[PDB]
Amino acid sequence: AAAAAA
Amino acid sequence: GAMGLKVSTKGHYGVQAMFDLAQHFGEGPVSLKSIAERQGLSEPYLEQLIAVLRKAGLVKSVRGAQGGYILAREPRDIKVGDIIRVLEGSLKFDFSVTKSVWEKVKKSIEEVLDSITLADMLKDAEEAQMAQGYMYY
Amino acid sequence: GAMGLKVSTKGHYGVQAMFDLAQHFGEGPVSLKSIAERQGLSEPYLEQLIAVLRKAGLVKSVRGAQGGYILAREPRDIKVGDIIRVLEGSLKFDFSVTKSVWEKVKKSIEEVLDSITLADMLKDAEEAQMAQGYMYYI
Ligand code: NA
Ligand code: NA
Protein backbone atom coordinates (compact mmCIF):
# COMPACT_ATOMS: atom_id res chain seq x y z
CA ALA A 1 0.00 0.00 0.00
CA ALA A 2 2.97 2.32 -0.63
CA ALA A 3 2.22 2.94 -4.27
CA ALA A 4 -0.63 1.90 -6.55
CA ALA A 5 -1.40 1.74 -10.27
CA ALA A 6 -3.53 2.93 -11.73
CA GLY B 1 5.89 -6.85 -0.67
CA ALA B 2 9.21 -5.03 -0.68
CA MET B 3 8.20 -1.59 -1.94
CA GLY B 4 4.54 -2.41 -1.35
CA LEU B 5 3.33 -1.77 -4.89
CA LYS B 6 -0.37 -2.57 -5.23
CA VAL B 7 -2.03 -3.10 -8.58
CA SER B 8 -5.60 -1.84 -8.99
CA THR B 9 -8.44 -4.20 -9.79
CA LYS B 10 -8.96 -2.30 -13.03
CA GLY B 11 -5.38 -2.65 -14.21
CA HIS B 12 -5.23 -6.29 -13.32
CA TYR B 13 -8.58 -7.23 -14.87
CA GLY B 14 -8.08 -4.90 -17.84
CA VAL B 15 -4.84 -6.59 -18.79
CA GLN B 16 -6.16 -10.10 -17.99
CA ALA B 17 -9.17 -9.60 -20.26
CA MET B 18 -7.11 -8.10 -23.08
CA PHE B 19 -4.63 -10.94 -22.85
CA ASP B 20 -7.44 -13.52 -22.96
CA LEU B 21 -8.63 -11.84 -26.17
CA ALA B 22 -5.05 -11.98 -27.49
CA GLN B 23 -4.97 -15.73 -26.81
CA HIS B 24 -8.11 -16.10 -28.90
CA PHE B 25 -7.32 -13.56 -31.66
CA GLY B 26 -6.65 -16.07 -34.44
CA GLU B 27 -9.61 -18.27 -33.60
CA GLY B 28 -12.09 -15.41 -33.61
CA PRO B 29 -14.76 -13.85 -31.34
CA VAL B 30 -15.41 -15.12 -27.83
CA SER B 31 -18.21 -14.29 -25.40
CA LEU B 32 -17.66 -12.13 -22.33
CA LYS B 33 -18.96 -15.01 -20.21
CA SER B 34 -16.14 -17.21 -21.53
CA ILE B 35 -13.53 -14.58 -20.64
CA ALA B 36 -14.98 -14.18 -17.15
CA GLU B 37 -14.93 -17.95 -16.70
CA ARG B 38 -11.35 -18.52 -17.85
CA GLN B 39 -9.94 -15.54 -15.96
CA GLY B 40 -11.98 -15.77 -12.77
CA LEU B 41 -13.57 -12.37 -13.26
CA SER B 42 -16.94 -10.97 -12.32
CA GLU B 43 -19.16 -10.62 -15.41
CA PRO B 44 -20.65 -7.24 -14.40
CA TYR B 45 -17.20 -5.76 -13.81
CA LEU B 46 -15.91 -7.19 -17.09
CA GLU B 47 -18.85 -5.77 -19.05
CA GLN B 48 -18.10 -2.28 -17.76
CA LEU B 49 -14.40 -2.74 -18.51
CA ILE B 50 -15.02 -3.92 -22.04
CA ALA B 51 -17.29 -0.96 -22.73
CA VAL B 52 -14.41 1.46 -22.16
CA LEU B 53 -11.94 -0.68 -24.09
CA ARG B 54 -14.43 -0.74 -26.97
CA LYS B 55 -14.87 3.04 -26.97
CA ALA B 56 -11.06 3.33 -27.05
CA GLY B 57 -10.87 1.17 -30.15
CA LEU B 58 -8.99 -1.63 -28.35
CA VAL B 59 -11.76 -4.23 -28.73
CA LYS B 60 -14.65 -4.64 -31.10
CA SER B 61 -17.97 -6.44 -30.97
CA VAL B 62 -19.01 -8.74 -33.79
CA ARG B 63 -22.63 -9.73 -34.52
CA GLY B 64 -21.92 -13.18 -35.92
CA ALA B 65 -23.76 -16.15 -34.47
CA GLN B 66 -20.89 -17.53 -32.50
CA GLY B 67 -19.99 -13.85 -32.33
CA GLY B 68 -18.70 -11.97 -29.31
CA TYR B 69 -15.60 -9.82 -28.80
CA ILE B 70 -12.19 -9.67 -30.51
CA LEU B 71 -9.17 -7.41 -30.33
CA ALA B 72 -9.56 -4.40 -32.61
CA ARG B 73 -5.78 -4.19 -33.29
CA GLU B 74 -3.21 -6.97 -33.60
CA PRO B 75 -1.52 -7.98 -30.32
CA ARG B 76 1.84 -6.69 -31.63
CA ASP B 77 0.25 -3.21 -31.92
CA ILE B 78 -1.12 -3.06 -28.36
CA LYS B 79 1.31 -2.11 -25.58
CA VAL B 80 0.36 -2.94 -22.00
CA GLY B 81 0.88 0.76 -21.36
CA ASP B 82 -1.82 1.56 -23.98
CA ILE B 83 -4.34 -0.48 -22.01
CA ILE B 84 -3.43 1.22 -18.73
CA ARG B 85 -3.60 4.71 -20.29
CA VAL B 86 -7.09 4.03 -21.62
CA LEU B 87 -8.43 2.87 -18.26
CA GLU B 88 -6.85 5.70 -16.27
CA GLY B 89 -8.32 9.21 -16.04
CA SER B 90 -1.77 32.14 -2.81
CA LEU B 91 0.57 30.58 -5.37
CA LYS B 92 4.30 30.00 -5.30
CA PHE B 93 6.83 27.62 -6.76
CA ASP B 94 9.06 25.49 -4.53
CA PHE B 95 10.91 22.60 -6.20
CA SER B 96 10.46 19.27 -4.41
CA VAL B 97 13.32 16.84 -4.80
CA THR B 98 11.06 14.18 -3.22
CA LYS B 99 8.51 14.66 -5.99
CA SER B 100 11.33 14.34 -8.53
CA VAL B 101 12.06 10.88 -7.12
CA TRP B 102 8.46 9.83 -7.71
CA GLU B 103 8.62 11.25 -11.24
CA LYS B 104 11.56 8.94 -11.84
CA VAL B 105 9.53 6.00 -10.50
CA LYS B 106 6.66 6.93 -12.81
CA LYS B 107 9.02 7.10 -15.79
CA SER B 108 10.45 3.66 -15.18
CA ILE B 109 6.97 2.10 -14.89
CA GLU B 110 5.92 3.80 -18.13
CA GLU B 111 9.04 2.43 -19.78
CA VAL B 112 8.40 -1.15 -18.65
CA LEU B 113 4.76 -1.07 -19.68
CA ASP B 114 5.51 0.47 -23.07
CA SER B 115 8.16 -2.18 -23.73
CA ILE B 116 5.72 -5.10 -23.51
CA THR B 117 3.03 -5.81 -26.07
CA LEU B 118 0.25 -8.39 -26.03
CA ALA B 119 2.32 -10.28 -28.63
CA ASP B 120 5.26 -10.38 -26.22
CA MET B 121 2.89 -11.78 -23.57
CA LEU B 122 1.67 -14.43 -26.01
CA LYS B 123 5.25 -15.52 -26.68
CA ASP B 124 6.09 -15.61 -22.96
CA ALA B 125 2.89 -17.56 -22.23
CA GLU B 126 3.89 -20.24 -24.70
CA GLU B 127 7.47 -20.54 -23.38
CA ALA B 128 6.59 -20.60 -19.68
CA GLN B 129 3.60 -22.96 -19.82
CA MET B 130 5.08 -25.61 -22.05
CA ALA B 131 5.88 -29.28 -21.73
CA GLN B 132 8.84 -31.10 -23.24
CA GLY B 133 11.09 -34.12 -22.88
CA TYR B 134 13.01 -33.70 -19.62
CA MET B 135 16.41 -33.91 -21.38
CA TYR B 136 15.73 -30.52 -22.99
CA TYR B 137 15.63 -28.59 -19.70
CA GLY C 1 -0.20 10.63 -14.23
CA ALA C 2 -0.82 8.80 -17.51
CA MET C 3 -0.18 5.41 -15.92
CA GLY C 4 -2.08 6.53 -12.83
CA LEU C 5 0.63 5.83 -10.25
CA LYS C 6 -0.42 7.06 -6.83
CA VAL C 7 2.07 7.58 -4.03
CA SER C 8 0.87 6.79 -0.50
CA THR C 9 0.89 9.51 2.13
CA LYS C 10 3.27 7.37 4.16
CA GLY C 11 5.80 7.09 1.35
CA HIS C 12 5.62 10.74 0.49
CA TYR C 13 5.84 11.99 4.07
CA GLY C 14 8.41 9.35 5.06
CA VAL C 15 10.78 10.46 2.34
CA GLN C 16 10.05 14.17 2.88
CA ALA C 17 10.85 13.89 6.59
CA MET C 18 14.01 11.86 6.00
CA PHE C 19 15.15 14.33 3.38
CA ASP C 20 14.54 17.26 5.75
CA LEU C 21 16.74 15.46 8.29
CA ALA C 22 19.38 14.94 5.57
CA GLN C 23 19.34 18.69 4.87
CA HIS C 24 20.08 19.34 8.53
CA PHE C 25 22.48 16.45 9.19
CA GLY C 26 25.63 18.55 9.45
CA GLU C 27 24.06 21.24 11.58
CA GLY C 28 22.69 18.76 14.10
CA PRO C 29 19.35 17.85 15.75
CA VAL C 30 16.10 19.50 14.80
CA SER C 31 12.68 19.35 16.42
CA LEU C 32 9.78 17.42 14.90
CA LYS C 33 7.76 20.65 14.96
CA SER C 34 10.36 22.31 12.73
CA ILE C 35 10.22 19.42 10.24
CA ALA C 36 6.43 19.55 10.15
CA GLU C 37 6.60 23.30 9.63
CA ARG C 38 9.09 23.20 6.76
CA GLN C 39 7.46 20.27 4.98
CA GLY C 40 3.80 21.08 5.55
CA LEU C 41 3.15 17.87 7.47
CA SER C 42 0.76 17.16 10.30
CA GLU C 43 2.71 16.78 13.54
CA PRO C 44 0.69 13.81 14.87
CA TYR C 45 1.30 11.90 11.65
CA LEU C 46 4.99 12.80 11.71
CA GLU C 47 5.31 11.65 15.35
CA GLN C 48 4.05 8.22 14.39
CA LEU C 49 6.25 8.05 11.30
CA ILE C 50 9.40 8.97 13.18
CA ALA C 51 8.65 6.33 15.80
CA VAL C 52 8.91 3.60 13.17
CA LEU C 53 11.97 5.14 11.49
CA ARG C 54 13.58 5.29 14.94
CA LYS C 55 12.89 1.63 15.72
CA ALA C 56 14.39 0.83 12.31
CA GLY C 57 17.63 2.60 13.16
CA LEU C 58 17.16 5.26 10.47
CA VAL C 59 16.78 8.16 12.90
CA LYS C 60 17.84 8.80 16.46
CA SER C 61 16.74 11.11 19.24
CA VAL C 62 19.19 13.29 21.16
CA ARG C 63 18.69 14.88 24.60
CA GLY C 64 20.40 18.25 24.06
CA ALA C 65 19.27 21.87 24.34
CA GLN C 66 19.10 21.76 20.62
CA GLY C 67 17.82 18.28 21.27
CA GLY C 68 15.58 16.65 18.72
CA TYR C 69 16.12 14.20 15.89
CA ILE C 70 19.00 13.41 13.51
CA LEU C 71 19.65 10.76 10.88
CA ALA C 72 21.16 7.64 12.45
CA ARG C 73 23.18 6.84 9.28
CA GLU C 74 24.91 9.22 6.84
CA PRO C 75 22.72 10.22 3.89
CA ARG C 76 25.04 8.35 1.48
CA ASP C 77 24.21 5.13 3.37
CA ILE C 78 20.42 5.53 3.17
CA LYS C 79 18.68 4.49 -0.07
CA VAL C 80 15.18 5.80 -0.71
CA GLY C 81 14.21 2.16 -1.08
CA ASP C 82 15.48 1.44 2.47
CA ILE C 83 13.03 4.02 3.80
CA ILE C 84 10.17 2.54 1.78
CA ARG C 85 11.01 -1.01 2.93
CA VAL C 86 10.92 0.06 6.58
CA LEU C 87 7.51 1.70 6.25
CA GLU C 88 5.89 -1.13 4.31
CA GLY C 89 4.53 -4.31 5.90
CA SER C 90 -8.29 -26.89 -3.59
CA LEU C 91 -4.80 -25.62 -4.46
CA LYS C 92 -3.28 -25.57 -7.93
CA PHE C 93 -0.57 -23.77 -9.84
CA ASP C 94 -1.46 -21.82 -12.98
CA PHE C 95 1.19 -19.40 -14.27
CA SER C 96 -0.11 -15.89 -14.95
CA VAL C 97 1.75 -13.95 -17.62
CA THR C 98 -0.19 -10.85 -16.47
CA LYS C 99 1.23 -11.17 -12.95
CA SER C 100 4.69 -11.53 -14.47
CA VAL C 101 4.21 -8.13 -16.08
CA TRP C 102 3.51 -6.60 -12.67
CA GLU C 103 6.56 -8.34 -11.26
CA LYS C 104 8.58 -6.53 -13.91
CA VAL C 105 7.00 -3.22 -12.90
CA LYS C 106 7.87 -3.95 -9.26
CA LYS C 107 11.46 -4.80 -10.09
CA SER C 108 11.96 -1.57 -12.04
CA ILE C 109 10.56 0.51 -9.16
CA GLU C 110 12.85 -1.31 -6.72
CA GLU C 111 15.78 -0.58 -9.02
CA VAL C 112 15.05 3.17 -9.21
CA LEU C 113 14.53 3.56 -5.47
CA ASP C 114 17.67 1.61 -4.64
CA SER C 115 19.66 3.75 -7.07
CA ILE C 116 18.96 7.00 -5.21
CA THR C 117 20.35 7.86 -1.80
CA LEU C 118 19.61 10.79 0.48
CA ALA C 119 23.05 12.12 -0.51
CA ASP C 120 22.01 12.03 -4.16
CA MET C 121 18.88 13.97 -3.24
CA LEU C 122 21.01 16.53 -1.35
CA LYS C 123 23.14 17.02 -4.46
CA ASP C 124 20.09 17.41 -6.71
CA ALA C 125 18.55 19.89 -4.24
CA GLU C 126 21.66 22.06 -4.49
CA GLU C 127 21.75 22.05 -8.31
CA ALA C 128 18.05 22.57 -8.93
CA GLN C 129 17.14 25.36 -6.52
CA MET C 130 20.32 27.39 -6.87
CA ALA C 131 20.85 30.86 -8.32
CA GLN C 132 23.62 32.12 -10.61
CA GLY C 133 24.63 34.87 -13.03
CA TYR C 134 22.47 34.50 -16.14
CA MET C 135 25.39 33.96 -18.56
CA TYR C 136 26.13 30.62 -16.87
CA TYR C 137 22.87 28.96 -17.90
CA ILE C 138 23.87 26.89 -20.94
NA1 NA D 1 -7.97 7.11 -20.03
NA1 NA E 1 8.69 -2.69 6.97
Decide if C3 and B85 are in contact by the 8 Å CB cutoff.
yes
CA of C87 to the centre of ligand 1 (A): 31
Decide if B7 and A5 are in contact by the 8 Å CB cutoff.
yes
DSSP C71-117: ESS-GGG-BHHHHHHHH---------HHHHHHHHHHHHHHHHHHS-B
C1-138 fold = Arc Repressor Mutant, subunit A (1.10.10)
C97 → closest Cβ in B7, B12, B124: B124
Contact B13, B46 (CB under 8 A): yes
CA of B86 to the centre of ligand 1 (A): 4
Technique that determined the structure: X-ray
Resolution, given in Å to one decimal, reads: 1.6
Could you name the CATH architecture of B1-137? Orthogonal Bundle (1.10)
Would an 8 Å CB–CB cutoff place B56 in contact with chain C? no
Counting ligands in written order, which one lies closest to the CA of residue A2? 2
CA distance B132 to B117: 26
Residue B4: how many other CB atoms lie within 10 Å: 19
Task: Please give the helix or strand (H or E) that residue B37 lies within, else none.
Answer: helix B32-39
Length of chain B in terms of residues written: 137
